[PDB]
């Protein structure tokens, strides 16, 4: 009982500090600047060929090669401009809920409810793509995989844990624990020294890869968090949940800043991504449409409605030229 | 640059040929999601037609069922993955009345799930012999766990197995109708629950799954050709 009382007192102190720092709201300060207005975006190319629903996509460091993972057991690597499949890796397990494309471009990753992160080497002398490594040790499904470099990889699991792996040795270099619900998504900072993970306990968490301890913890949603991704500057991140809302957190402010929602939307959110400037929050919804929110006004600036099912994948290029939406109708579209 | 574009072209041609072959393979295979709980014979069902994967073949049609048991108790996230499946095979132990209510809650949630309201559920009320022994013993009464059973009568359309105690038939069909009530409360006709009385020693569950999926696909084909 004393421990519970101390925890409640610490939480009360945290709320008091957050309220004290909350001198003004984001919307009031940002009301001075002009909104971007309605955003018109159309399907330039429809990358089709996937046989089933797509769960993850990731743009390469080169803004042309993208990689998309679908439960028909495929990891297809496309050339965005020419709509050409550069590669088509068959997967051991059909249900891949995540995929990554290494910054060097030499490797890709898959993971899902098989509980193994399979890393495939692309730039191989012997022609076809081969399975480079397999990372086992997560006792829950894997929902997000991100590459720090050719050897360091962060994988979040449904067992309320994250893990930094050294790819060469294949064993968990570091394990991040402290979530009380399934971790559904993660993102790496542009500096790649910190990373935030959102879980099913309506909680996001800033972790330091070197230390291995939870640097910060953010709350504010009402239900499971499905998506998370840093602001381009690395000092903020937006999270979408099943209660049809986005919320933006700043790491230094240590609380929520703006809430994106409307009465007419009740479906949850499934994927969130940022543009280069961070002006636009692209969020995938279960109502078959993507929405683009203004980070400063929190008013929908446009709807990407071209999918016959829920959107599960949002990818924004490193150079910001194109975005790609992957849906459960086995279609991946690019909206330039 | 032209040589690179041409090379990319035959690479695309080869990969598209591979994906056409793989689509032909994929559309001919049906995925089934195996669900249940402890003391429910999911493993016995899996082994009786000969883990994370189970491969079986009926009438030269390949079904793939998946006992997702490597995760935690929470199901709301990884159950969203199984909506392209043709069916959800829900195996429940009808003997345990305790954890029967949890099973009804699970079935209700699966039936009313947004991403499972199109996927029909094949309901396997397993361990019918255990239920028969429990009701014949009489030490544990179903009325304690379900007072409605005290005012339930066997429906006239029931087809009990010959030489069965009518109390056993009443209990079996009572639990079956309890599941079917949730089935028909919000079915809307897009998906239907197909109850079956299965035991551990039976050897025709694969045929039931096959016929059930054939019925599902027949209904889907009538739907797409707008017959009904």
């Amino acid at each position, epitope marked *: 009982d004393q421990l519970r009382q101390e925890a409640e007192q610490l939480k009360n102190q945290i709320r008091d500090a957050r309220k004290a720092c909350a001198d003004a709201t984001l919307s009031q300060i940002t009301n001075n600047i002009d909104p971007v207005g309605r955003i018109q975006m159309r399907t330039r190319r429809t990358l089709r060929g996937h046989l089933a629903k797509i769960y993850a996509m990731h743009w390469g460091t080169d803004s042309r090669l993208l990689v998309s993972a679908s439960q028909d057991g495929k990891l297809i690597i496309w050339d965005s401009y020419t709509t050409n499949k550069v590669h088509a890796i068959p997967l051991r397990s059909s249900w891949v809920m995540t995929c990554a494309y290494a910054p060097s471009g030499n490797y890709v990753a898959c993971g899902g409810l098989d509980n193994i992160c399979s890393i495939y080497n692309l730039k191989t002398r012997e022609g076809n793509v081969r399975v480079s490594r397999e990372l086992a040790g997560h006792t829950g499904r894997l929902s997000c995989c991100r590459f720090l470099d050719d050897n360091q990889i962060v994988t979040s699991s449904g067992d309320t844990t994250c893990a930094l792996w050294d790819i060469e040795t294949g064993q968990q270099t570091t394990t991040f624990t402290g979530h009380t619900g399934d971790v559904m998504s993660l993102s790496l900072a542009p500096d790649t020294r910190l990373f935030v993970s959102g879980a099913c306990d309506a909680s996001a968490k800033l972790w330091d890869v070197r230390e291995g301890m939870c640097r910060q913890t953010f709350t504010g949603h009402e239900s499971d968090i499905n998506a998370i991704c840093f602001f381009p500057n690395g000092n903020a991140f937006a999270t979408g949940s099943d209660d049809a809302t986005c919320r933006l957190f700043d790491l230094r402010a240590d609380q929520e800043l703006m809430t994106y929602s409307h009465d007419n939307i009740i479906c949850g959110i499934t994927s969130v991504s940022f543009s280069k400037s961070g002006r636009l929050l692209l969020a995938g919804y279960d109502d078959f449409n993507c929405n683009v929110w203004d980070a400063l006004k929190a008013d929908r600036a446009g709807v990407l409605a071209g999918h016959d099912n829920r959107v599960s994948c949002l990818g924004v290029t490193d150079d910001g030229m194109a975005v790609a939406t992957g849906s459960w109708d086995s279609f991946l579209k690019i909206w330039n | 640059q032209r040589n690179e574009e041409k090379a990319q072209r035959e690479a695309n041609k080869k990969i598209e040929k591979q994906l056409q072959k793989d689509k032909q393979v994929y559309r001919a295979t049906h995925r089934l999601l195996l669900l249940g709980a402890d003391n429910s014979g999911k493993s016995t069902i899996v082994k009786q037609m000969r883990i994370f994967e189970t491969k079986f073949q009926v009438d030269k049609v390949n079904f793939h069922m998946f006992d997702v048991g490597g995760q*935690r108790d929470e199901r709301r996230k990884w159950i969203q993955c199984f909506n392209d499946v043709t069916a959800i095979i829900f195996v429940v132990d009808s003997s345990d009345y305790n954890r029967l209510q949890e099973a009804l809650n699970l079935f209700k949630s699966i039936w009313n799930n947004r991403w499972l309201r199109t996927i029909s559920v094949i309901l396997f009320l397993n361990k019918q012999d255990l239920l028969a022994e429990k009701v014949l013993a009489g030490k544990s009464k179903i009325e304690d766990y379900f007072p409605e059973f005290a005012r339930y009568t066997t429906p006239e359309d029931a087809t009990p197995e010959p030489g069965e105690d009518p109390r056993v038939t009443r209990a079996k069909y009572f639990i079956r109708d309890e599941f079917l009530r949730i089935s028909t409360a919000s079915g809307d006709g897009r998906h239907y629950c197909y109850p079956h009385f299965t035991c551990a020693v039976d050897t025709e569950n694969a045929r039931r799954i096959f016929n059930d999926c054939r019925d599902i696909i027949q209904r889907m084909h009538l739907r797409q050709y707008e017959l009904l």
Partner: nanobody, 127 residues
């Protein structure tokens, strides 16, 4: 953060009565199906009762049907379970749980180890 603080419970002789209330904070109370789940010593979680978004759809576990009544106060953001004619098997830790998704008739909230949106619970001893 989501909070579900339960009040009530205690020692009651068999055949007695109690009113377990629980106040919920951190979300829109009307959007979530509310449940009462009890855990007796020596056994796992057991779903007792549930009430829907508008209170029109009400269901109970068969063992506690008739005796126990569910109710939901939207204005007070709280959930009440009234227990009457108690039995020795009713001693347990009682939790009020949200179904994880709003505007949904489906939920998975009897998790054995940890469920994120479950209250701290109150001890109800019937002896």
């Amino acid at each position: 953060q989501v909070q579900l603080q339960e009040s009530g419970g205690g020692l009651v002789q068999p055949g007695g009565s109690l009113r377990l209330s629980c106040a919920a904070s951190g979300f829109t109370f009307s959007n979530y199906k509310m449940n009462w789940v009890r855990q007796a010593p020596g056994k796992g979680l057991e779903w007792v009762s549930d009430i829907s978004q508008s209170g029109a759809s009400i269901s109970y576990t068969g063992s506690v049907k008739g005796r126990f009544t569910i109710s939901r106060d939207n204005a007070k953001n709280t959930l009440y379970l009234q227990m009457n004619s108690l039995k020795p098997e009713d001693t347990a830790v009682y939790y009020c749980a949200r179904c994880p998704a709003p505007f949904t008739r489906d939920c998975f909230d009897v998790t054995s180890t940890t469920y994120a949106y479950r209250g701290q619970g109150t001890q109800v001893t019937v002896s």
